[PDB]
Structure formats: structure tokens, C-alpha cells
């Protein structure tokens, strides 16, 4: 069980916790702001997933400052976790290519 596979794992779980706390904090921050649409958990969660993967359809978005802060954190956790996985994949490919070379 190599580090790079532990961080990836630890990053997927952590991502899921952020998605969830994100959907939660998002609604809490957005309710109260007139015209706001990020106001029910079920969709707030879909909003999160879309933001973490950075797809950002725009059908949903925070309009308050805290909502936006929650947004920044979700984006970053998403980018960091997905980048941590591709990093784990490069450690795997790089170490194995060494094997196929003898070393």
C-alpha cells in the first residue's frame, strides 16, 4: 500500500465529505438572499459535484459571499483531489516503466 495510492484514496473520501458539507453550507449561506436558487439540499449537492469536477453548467450558482466562499473551497478540493489522482497514476506508470527497463 504505497503512499500515492493512500493519498488518492484519502482524497476521494475527503472530496465526498467536502461535497456534502458543501451542499449543506451552501443552502445555509444562500437562503435569505432574494432571488437565490441554491436553496434545497438535493440540488445544492448536484451543484457541488458540478463545481468540484469544475464542469460548472451555470444552471445553479451561489449569489452570496459565503456561498461563494464555500464555492471556492469546493472547486479547490475538487481540483486538488482529481489532480492528486492523476499524480498517483503518474507514480504508478513511472515506477512500472522502470521495471520494464530492468531497474
Amino acid at each position: 500500500s504505497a503512499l500515492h495510492w493512500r493519498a488518492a484514496g484519502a482524497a476521494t473520501v475527503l472530496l465526498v465529505i467536502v461535497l456534502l458539507a458543501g451542499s449543506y453550507l451552501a443552502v445555509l449561506a444562500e437562503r435569505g438572499a432574494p432571488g437565490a436558487q441554491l436553496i434545497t439540499y438535493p440540488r445544492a449537492l448536484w451543484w457541488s459535484v458540478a463545481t468540484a469536477t469544475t464542469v460548472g453548467y451555470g444552471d445553479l450558482y451561489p449569489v452570496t459571499l459565503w456561498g461563494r466562499c464555500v464555492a471556492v473551497v469546493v472547486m479547490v478540493a475538487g481540483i486538488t483531489s482529481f489532480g492528486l489522482v492523476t499524480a498517483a497514476l503518474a507514480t504508478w506508470f513511472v515506477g512500472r516503466e522502470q521495471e520494464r527497463r530492468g531497474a
Epitope: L28, A33, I39
Partner: antibody, heavy 118, light 108 residues
């Protein structure tokens, strides 16, 4: 079983203030919001405000003159609406409902009739 | 804020007949509309959520339709117990909003 319980009624003199209650029971979650709707005789429903017990934050209907103030009590599972400095205009049936963060009110209280006279 | 227009205010229908109530929103709200029933001296009761999803415990008589800005709450075969005031409410944008209401009336 009756999920939300409210006091059948309350009497109040002008300029005074009352504190209504809504004790909930059943499947409680952290995602739960308790709402307060006001219904003057003959007229329709009117959203007053919301509060999330688990976090304790509350929002109010800014379109109307703000008279209510919401609070909650985790342990006892009771929500409170502090209406202060009332007039004849403020007397009606005040309901409370439970909303599970998905937008609709699945359960309502029997409501509390409030009269404002001397 | 979103404005739900519920007109006509009163509806007069003969028993067993089919009846339809309308709710109109100031702007597109998807299907984030919900119907409540309120009889004389009773509290509101959820009838339909998200415009078409059926609730348990509610006669199969009630059904809703619509999306966007026009929504309809139908009753297949009206009857005495269905006499009341019906309201629509939206969850699309904060704050939640209620319709002015519609009173059902039967002509026997």
C-alpha cells in the same frame, strides 16, 4: 402521531408581545427547517420566516414589516416565534411547518389563534 | 420575489366531474411548485409536490401537471370532501411564495 404541537390560542394587548411555540417530534434531522406562516381570517397564507434548528440561523420575509424573531431549543425540540409590539393587524392564525430542506412543507401544526385586544 | 397567480379565485363544478386549478409564476420555476389543501378550519395539507409527484395518503383523484410558469392541479371526479381552498407554493427561488388561493365549490 401529531408531529408539530402549537398552543390553541394566545391573547395580547396592543404594544405588547408574545412568544409562540411549536414542539416537534418524529424523525428529526439536521437538514430540517421550521417555517412560520401567517393567515388572517378570510385571507390566504403568508410566509413569515424560517429557522434551521441544528445551526440556529433564521431568515424573515423582508416584504412585510418585521415583527417576528425566531429562536430554537435543541434539547426540547421546540421552535419559538417572538412577535412584539402588535396591533389589530397582527392578529390571526399562525402556523408552523416542518420542511426537510427540499422546499415543500410536509407537515403543519394545528396553528395558534392570536387575538390582539384589551 | 416570485408571484404565483391563482385564477379563477372560485370554481363551480358538478359532482363526479373533472376540475382544474391554475397557478402562474412571474418567471420560469421548473417544476418547483407544490399544492396544498385547506378545508374550513383545518390546517394546510400537502397534496402534490414538484408539480406532479404524488404524495402518500392522498386520493388517486388528485394529480398535477405543468412546468415553467404554468401549472395545473386536477381532480378526477370531484366530491364533497374536496370542497376547500387550494394553494400553490414555490421552492425555486428564495423566499418561498404562496398563491392567493382558490376555493372549490360544488353545485348539487
Amino acid at each position: 402521531q401529531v408531529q408539530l404541537q402549537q398552543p390553541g390560542a394566545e391573547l395580547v394587548k396592543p404594544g405588547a408581545s408574545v412568544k409562540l411555540s411549536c414542539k416537534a417530534s418524529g424523525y428529526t434531522f439536521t437538514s430540517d427547517w421550521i417555517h412560520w406562516v401567517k393567515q388572517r381570517p378570510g385571507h390566504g397564507l403568508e410566509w413569515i420566516g424560517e429557522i434551521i434548528p441544528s445551526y440556529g440561523r433564521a431568515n424573515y420575509n423582508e416584504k412585510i414589516q418585521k415583527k417576528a424573531t425566531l429562536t430554537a431549543d435543541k434539547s426540547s425540540s421546540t421552535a419559538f416565534m417572538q412577535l412584539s409590539s402588535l396591533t389589530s393587524e397582527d392578529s390571526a392564525v399562525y402556523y408552523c411547518a416542518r420542511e426537510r430542506g427540499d422546499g415543500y412543507f410536509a407537515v403543519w401544526g394545528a396553528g395558534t389563534t392570536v387575538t390582539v385586544s384589551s | 420575489d416570485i408571484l404565483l397567480t391563482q385564477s379563477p379565485a372560485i370554481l363551480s363544478v358538478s359532482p363526479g366531474e373533472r376540475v382544474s386549478f391554475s397557478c402562474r409564476a412571474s418567471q420560469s420555476i421548473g417544476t418547483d411548485i407544490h399544492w396544498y389543501q385547506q378545508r374550513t378550519n383545518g390546517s394546510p395539507r400537502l397534496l402534490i409536490k414538484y408539480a406532479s409527484e404524488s404524495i402518500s395518503g392522498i386520493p388517486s383523484r388528485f394529480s398535477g401537471s405543468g412546468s415553467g410558469t404554468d401549472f395545473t392541479l386536477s381532480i378526477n371526479s370531484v366530491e364533497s370532501e374536496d370542497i376547500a381552498n387550494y394553494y400553490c407554493q414555490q421552492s425555486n427561488r428564495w423566499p418561498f411564495t404562496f398563491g392567493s388561493g382558490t376555493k372549490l365549490e360544488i353545485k348539487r
